[PDB]
Symmetry: D2
Subunit: 142 residues, 4 copies
């Protein structure tokens, strides 16, 4: 069993991102999302799957999907923003198992990733515990 | 804009179903899930999309996916249980736009549905508000 | 350290009780409330304190407070309903350390308790794990 | 009826503050706490009462209580930190109706307030809507 525990940080009172969606990819017997002590906890049965969280700021017409998983026994993460209305977490999560650019992001097995949207706001994932079954990450909204 | 506000009722202290997943299908400009006053609220850009909630009772090895949406300007609902490990809400939600028996449940535009798992536990959805932009449903776990 | 983990069951689709308040008494170095995998978890520093949860059904103008704690190394529980508007969980929780009938309920160290409100609705607390540091209870709304 | 809707911003990936308590003072027909679209909403029957939230960062031994209310038809707010183990939100909330320095903080009817703990971390409340029945505020953890 792997877990990925996620702490969400929102660094500026400009806009407000709320949680709107959480998905589980079907590989390795799937997975679950849990709220545990104010954290998002992704539990997976083995290596080779993932889960996504979508956040939306309606004040500023902004959004992003953050995906976390384990690929060949190492954690990975990715952020996708500049989402169309058709790009829900359900769509984005699935794409990490067929779309080349998404595949590569997952294949990179990164301990940290950051990206800016069209408005120049940065989003980041940083794993604070990068090894073992029980992984920890910060999700940082700039 | 459509909303569907869901009240969850767990009726018997045998096992414990917890929320593990919430998805949004991509049609009609997507949609979102919100927690509002102890209720799950699905917001949708217009007619023709849906969202799924998955619940798991790990005590008793039981689970189900409940799906809610609007089809041709009327509400619909369905429950799927006896899930394989591969059947997350991500997977199930999509099947309502291609798989014939799932297509049928959507086309049925039901105000009320119920089914049972192989263990004999019943799951039900009853809309209490069936018309208009702001719909309401009970999700009853037996 | 004691923990009491609480599963809430709402048994009838008549009215809807939503969580509105969660308090901690000051004795034994206090304590915290956490949400953990869909359950309410009361964590306390040692024996001799407690915490309260209030639920409101504004549809039917019903409310109650359920209090959980440890007194002389045994778990206890109680429910107060037919609440005035001035009887928040903040108020009720404190009454268990000065008000004689509340004191008595705490001193009973019950593994289960049930009571009916003005409208004949039954509320129940039933501990499923009655011994040790990590206690479990069902909160059942009839 | 007054509402105060609160958006929480945790700005710094050092330590993690989780919600552990939410209370309602008994005056003016009391009040309730709701989770609404990822925000904390305090509802109160009229002017002259309040509610408190407590947040704890176990990793760094930090905590605080943030209190919001309406005093003589104008909003107020306060933060207390450097807490003892006996100072739960239950205790702090009610000190605003008896303890002079706390009474004064409330009598100030502030639209913004900030204070630091002994470790130098700033906490802040910033009302973004300051007038009328439905007030809005940012809670910023530095
Ligand atoms: C070990 C790992 O991680 N692997 C991976 C995978 O996962 C998998 O899947 C399968 C189906 O296919 C099953 O489910 C199992 O259980 C799991 O584990 C996948 O995910 C992939 C992506 O696609 O990746 C990885 O691997 C690699 C190899 N080479 C293959 O391809 O298989
Ligand atoms: C009106 C309605 O409801 N419709 C529907 C639909 O939805 C749609 O989709 C599209 C794509 O394709 C888009 O997205 C839009 O926006 C929406 O709205 C669909 O869903 C279907 C299912 O498949 O169903 C319904 O319909 C039928 C017909 N075609 C019509 O349209 O009417
Ligand atoms: C051990 C026990 O449980 N005890 C109890 C108590 O608690 C206490 O408190 C105190 C203050 O005062 C402190 O905080 C400590 O820490 C604790 O532990 C109390 O609560 C009481 C009630 O009031 O009860 C019990 O007890 C015993 C005797 N009997 C007396 O009373 O004291
Ligand atoms: C209007 C206002 O805000 N006022 C106030 C108050 O509140 C009140 O309280 C009472 C009892 O006593 C009752 O509950 C009612 O309902 C309410 O409204 C209080 O809070 C106070 C503080 O302590 O403050 C205010 O005021 C002033 C003086 N004290 C008088 O006026 O009385
Ligand atoms: C700005 C943006 O969202 N770009 C994303 C990038 O972050 C992600 O790594 C890549 C692979 O999924 O797909 C997009 O190009
Ligand atoms: C036992 C079970 O899960 N049955 C489901 C049924 O409830 C649902 O209406 C149908 C269409 O999606 O798919 C399955 O037959
Ligand atoms: C109907 C009702 O709520 N009665 C309660 C009772 O359940 C509780 O055990 C006792 C001590 O606190 O007093 C209260 O009034
Ligand atoms: C560091 C600290 O917690 N100081 C608080 C202050 O913020 C508050 O305004 C006052 C009134 O309650 O009580 C204390 O002095």
């Amino acid at each position: 069993t792997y877990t990925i525990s996620i702490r969400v940080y929102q660094t500026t009172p400009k806009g407000f991102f709320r949680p709107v969606e959480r998905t589980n990819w079907k590989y390795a017997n799937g997975g679950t999302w849990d709220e545990v002590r104010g954290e998002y906890v992704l539990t997976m049965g083995g290596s080779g799957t993932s889960g996504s969280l979508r956040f939306v700021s309606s004040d500023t017409d902004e959004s992003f999907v953050a995906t976390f998983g384990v690929h060949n026994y190492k954690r990975w993460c990715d952020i996708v923003t500049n989402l169309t209305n058709e790009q829900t977490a359900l769509v984005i999560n699935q794409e990490y198992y067929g779309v080349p650019i998404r595949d590569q992001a997952r294949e990179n097995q990164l301990t940290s990733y950051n990206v800016a949207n069209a408005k120049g706001r940065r989003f980041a994932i940083e794993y604070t515990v990068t090894e073992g079954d029980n992984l920890k990450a910060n999700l940082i909204i700039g």
